[PDB]
């Protein structure tokens, strides 16, 4: 009467691993002036395609008696075809990367999903422009289209107002300059050039609880002390975030003078409360750790100075220790060493942690900068197998 | 018609201490500058107290303070006595970029003090290491700048190469990979010397188990006195360094010869032996006297240059030329028809006062080419590949700005360079 | 080119007091201030430790930090205390209770600027800063509290210098205090992220070394530290004195540290023998490399034959010959290739100085890094868990009020610290 009905087991540790987005250098007032005239165009070696999201750089393949890098090509082929999830180019507008990456996540993190955004690439490429951007030419910039910060801040007063719920905007800006933690949303009266009294009582002030608080409830979740959240009722109060962008450390180098020297971890906390139909209030808290990074400076190429040397190396040490996390995640090693860099202790939450995140690959377009892109294509190819498990956020009675 | 020396790193400085001692022995030169009748490495003062044309580079104060307070300190001029503040401390990144940009404007200035003095400069040689960060980093910076400054001279490198079995520091394969790829980009000629087979000469030709870095380099120093110092002098068929450019190296980048030295005779072996021409020519083709860990039987012979010393009759050599052509087990190449360049000068090699070798009537510095080194290229490379797999010792150079894209560059094109030794005997 | 010294703790002040007794013996040095050496190398490389002014004195680069009078009083009352000058003895008249939660936190805070200015008195007068030497405890509080607060400040003063410290590992065998597993575990919270390296020396092996391997009767603090003091001076010899393979401390920082968190090391002295065994022994290069393999001559209580060596520094002292030196080093690598790591082919770094210390003709310094140095941590960490369950004698520190979020994390520091040797152990 009866046949077998063979069964299979499951794994609920998580399959929603990671998103890898490649938006690269491109459309500028200065950069298509020199890239497309004289060198081959917007993807000269690279051959940009967006639908299958494949891209494949080369150099000139000739019979070298000492064979140089990227002579791996054939009679007619493309090589190192690093296909990704979605690769974007110069034509990717601020609303376009919003429409594919940022925006549809900003309706998913309204219920408790958490994210962390960072960029990675060669120095002077546009890590600052992707995060910060600039407000467009309006007589009143009513949180206009810009980088990923103010356009989500436009969505901050949009979808938290579209929800029509009890929300609480919370934003804390912390510098990471030579692996230290500095608030710029503070009063900063000791920071500014002011005159202390003739009887000095506070010429230095260690006050902020800048130490990691390991709770060990889940794993990877980061807790610091004395964070300063930002409560703004409209977009006019976002200029104190611009003050943090103003006082963030920048460098004037031969590679780039618009390159930011330091980098910051800037968190989001959308503390949104509404009661469910069961009679249960739901603390929907999304987290968007908007973490800008500085440039991987080729210090021999910029020819930096002594005060710029220990700055550029520790930025390079931060990106090196970042790559020390990447190979450990994909080989599945037991005690993944987050503890060297505090930014990696900040990246316990999503690199091997629980919730979502994404990667931005702003890499250069020049022919001399292709093996420099290979150090980024080193970790962008490794970027997929990062085990995670997303979750929402609610409140129990 | 002159030539310059450059001493980079703790290895390359200590090389010249025996070399210039032999060069003082080339003309009976006391620590003042006494010599009769010569300007190759020499400028002359008013008193005739000649000075070397050498370059001292030490990021430490340490190694030069041995020299310029010890013996022969009066022959070297404080024009040449160029020391530094702090070592790179075995850092290619700091020797090239960080600490290397500190004394480079003083050393290049001494060149315009001295290359201006050279009446038709032939070229120069560079003494450095592959493992030490001063000998690797500062070599990588200066040779690129000398290509800007003198792109029409000779760029010789007598570079100590580490053994794939005997090593002194960990990052020695981690140094020379980044070093030599930029060196292949610029340099004219680069040698490889391994203390592995020099120990084999210390035990089987010198028969002494107690060496110092002097006697490990007096062997090397006796080569260089036969390489160039005899070329001002006139024997049967004198050669200069310009007769090696397209001649020794038949391509733009094949410039990696193999130097041997056949008569290495401990002082008691003057009597269980009676030297001739054809003996030491056969002694040049031992795999046990290669001076580098390599076996030429597994490779080929693209070239073979016989540079002789002392009393040499070419009709006797024409026997020994035809001997090893008949006595071959060599797998000679297809592309070179017969080209075996003959160099016969007049002067016998000199006895080191307090040395180990004996007074021989004749000496050979044989430069040959093989793909046996292409194995020994890859042997230190396999030491390098495992450190990049674990990404160990990586924080010292990224902190001075050395990218991982360099390691996909420098190693894989060195590995591509090793594949180009194979391209010698393919098309026939 | 110049090396600055700091001392702290009831041990490390005395441990340092024995050390400059050795360095005075090293260069022919009068306690009063006159030169009586004869070697030029004693005179030529004065500048590595030394300071010069007018006055026909020996005037130290020695800043000495304490909160007890009678310790450094007895240093000053004893010989080689008048070799100091009183422009350096910065201390306070307050008992720290041998507490990490006071010397780092309250009572050391009354003495911070009185030390860091004297640092600025020296470091601005220094020609070329190269070493920030610290000698302290990890079992008491003056060594652990006041040591960690300096490194939070001197690294802030000098991010690009060398931060070494000689931190004494506690011994589970011989001790008198109780809260011993607090001074170590909380000092770990600062010594990891702000020191370029530290050593790991434990008395727990030293009771075995002097008694058994040296054939002595009672392990005394004047001689348990005298064994340490020779190994302290052996570190930077090729920096100080000429050698064929002159190796920097930064070279020693490069080649012995493949990963910047595994900066824990172990010294080793090569002629560790008794007095009467001189006439039953010839001294050779295999004799010096013999105690590389010896477990009892490891000054920390760890079996090198249990784990596997990560990196090994061979720092030699004497007129040697390299083919004898390198092959005997190669013979040990061929002997115990199973006790090594694979991705490092050159498992042992050699370092040859040209001058041995006086009294010896051959000498060396073993400096190893093995995957069993983690064992001394697991002694104290499980004690630290046993101190946390009952929270036993927490009413000495609750008035100080150091947080449990600190104390869970110092174990979480220790848990990530120990377990990553065992990634690359086997
Ligand atoms: C009869 C005689 O003189 O014998 C020697 C001696 O034979 C032995 C036994 C010595 C002796 O040392 C000890 O017994 C000892 C015990 C505990 C702690 C330290 C030392 C010696 O004290 C040690 C001393 O060694 C030195 O002087 C070294 O250079 C050493 N110097 C000092 O420790 C020292 C300190 C203050 C004043 C004088 C010397 C050193 C080694 C490395 C780096 C720095 C310093 C000398 C000559 C001896 C005796 C006296 C027995 C040994 O030690 C050293 C450090 O050399 C023990 O193992 C060696 C083997 C030696 O053969
Ligand atoms: N044959 C020989 N090799 C040497 C000698 N001195 C150093 N070397 C080699 O050089 C390597 C290290 O290079 P060094 O010249 O000593 O160091 P450096 O170039 O001054 O750069 P640093 O490491 O920063 O000091 C060692 O691994 C040795 O193999 C020498 O006198 N003779
Ligand atoms: N895809 C792009 N779209 C528009 N402008 C771009 C793009 N890529 C680069 N740019 C422009 O290129 C400029 C140079 O980039 P920049 O942001 O200054 O350097 P960086 O990579 O951010 N360095 P750093 O600040 O140290 O992280 C930016 O300011 C933009 O104006
Ligand atoms: N070798 C040695 N160890 C000591 C000496 N005095 C104390 N110790 C050790 O030091 C540790 C206690 O630290 P201590 O320096 O005495 O206290 P502190 O002044 O508060 O740092 C314990 O492990 C003791 O065994 C000494 O003279 N010699
Ligand atoms: Mg940007
Ligand atoms: Mg050097």
Author numbering:
A (entry chain K): 61 to 457
B (entry chain A): 2 to 38, 49 to 439
C (entry chain B): 2 to 44, 47 to 360, 369 to 437
Q: Can you quote the paper on this entry?
A:
Kinesins are microtubule (MT)-based ATP-driven motors that have many important roles in eukaryotes.
Like BimC from A. nidulans and Cut7 from S. pombe, U. maydis kinesin-5 has a 72 residue N-terminal extension. Although the density observed depends on the overall resolution of the reconstruction and the display threshold used, little interpretable density is visible in the N+UmKin5 reconstruction beyond the N-terminus of the motor domain itself, i.e. our structures do not provide any structural information about the U. maydis kinesin-5 N-terminal extension. This was also the case in reconstructions of MTs bound by the Cut7 motor domain, and is presumably because the N-terminus does not adopt a regular structure and cannot be visualized in our calculated structure.
